[PDB]
């Protein structure tokens, strides 16, 4: 199967980088509207990250782009070193989402309310 025009192909998936700078939530919804099965990129190998990084470095002027993982620390299982569970909570509202670099295969995070470019992906 082939990829739609203006989309790049790797393995058996289709990728496309978008410059518009949006929030995590928005980028994801946006990807959703671009094609069936489309979402923010997800990675399952070094080779794949390499591909979108090269593809992304030659198109984006920015340095960071949104990745399909959100609220990375809100889902965690927090526990007090004294063994007990945090029944009472006083956290500071914080939502970190993953972002990729345009010059490396390593990832970082950023407040999900921040604004960055991104890349969408879908199968078939």
């Amino acid at each position: 199967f082939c990829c739609p025009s203006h989309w790049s192909s790797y393995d058996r998936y289709c990728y496309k980088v978008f410059k518009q700078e949006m929030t995590w939530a928005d980028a994801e919804k946006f990807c959703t509207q671009q094609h069936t099965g489309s979402h923010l990129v997800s990675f399952h190998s070094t080779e794949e990250v390499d591909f979108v990084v090269k593809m992304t470095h030659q198109s984006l002027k920015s340095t960071f782009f949104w990745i399909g993982a959100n609220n990375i620390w809100n889902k965690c299982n927090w526990q007090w070193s004294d063994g007990t569970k945090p029944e009472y909570k006083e956290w500071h509202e914080e939502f970190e989402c993953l972002i990729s670099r345009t010059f490396d295969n390593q990832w970082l995070s950023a407040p999900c309310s921040d604004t960055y470019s991104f890349v969408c992906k879908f199968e078939a």
């Binding site: 399952h44 399909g68 993982a69 299982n77 007090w80 004294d82 006083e90």
Partner: protein
């Protein structure tokens, strides 16, 4: 009743040490101080207020962050097990510098709300234990 330099609130003893240490070392340090001792745990707004008050009165002006006992139990780099497309997060290249599995309090907010943080940072910390009667 409690050792010198320690404060007694409700039924426990607290104390902030102005020695820069990472979470693990701080926690180990605390356990050596007394039976059942650990890095402080905040289990109510009343205790939160007291601990904040205490930190304010005894922390070094140079230091601004203080460690507390909350830590991520998960073994993975970050805790999101699935990507927005439904697939599992089996490959993860998050940088250590961005792995924030520990927590702390900061002077900027009167030492009240809790913030996530790297566990390799060296900062002051408060211990807590229940005295015997």
């Amino acid at each position: 009743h409690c050792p010198s330099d320690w404060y007694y609130y409700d039924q426990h003893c607290y104390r902030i040490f102005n020695e820069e240490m990472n979470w693990e070392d701080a926690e180990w340090f605390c356990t050596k101080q007394a039976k059942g001792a650990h890095l402080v745990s905040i289990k109510s707004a009343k205790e939160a207020d007291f601990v904040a008050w205490m930190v304010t009165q005894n922390i070094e002006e140079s230091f601004s962050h203080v460690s507390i006992g909350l830590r991520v139990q998960n073994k993975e780099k970050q805790c999101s097990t699935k990507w927005s497309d439904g697939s599992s997060v089996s490959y993860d290249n998050l940088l250590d510098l961005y792995i924030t599995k520990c927590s702390l309090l900061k002077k900027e907010t009167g030492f009240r709300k809790w913030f996530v943080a790297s566990c390799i940072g060296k900062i002051p910390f408060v211990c807590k234990f229940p005295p015997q009667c």
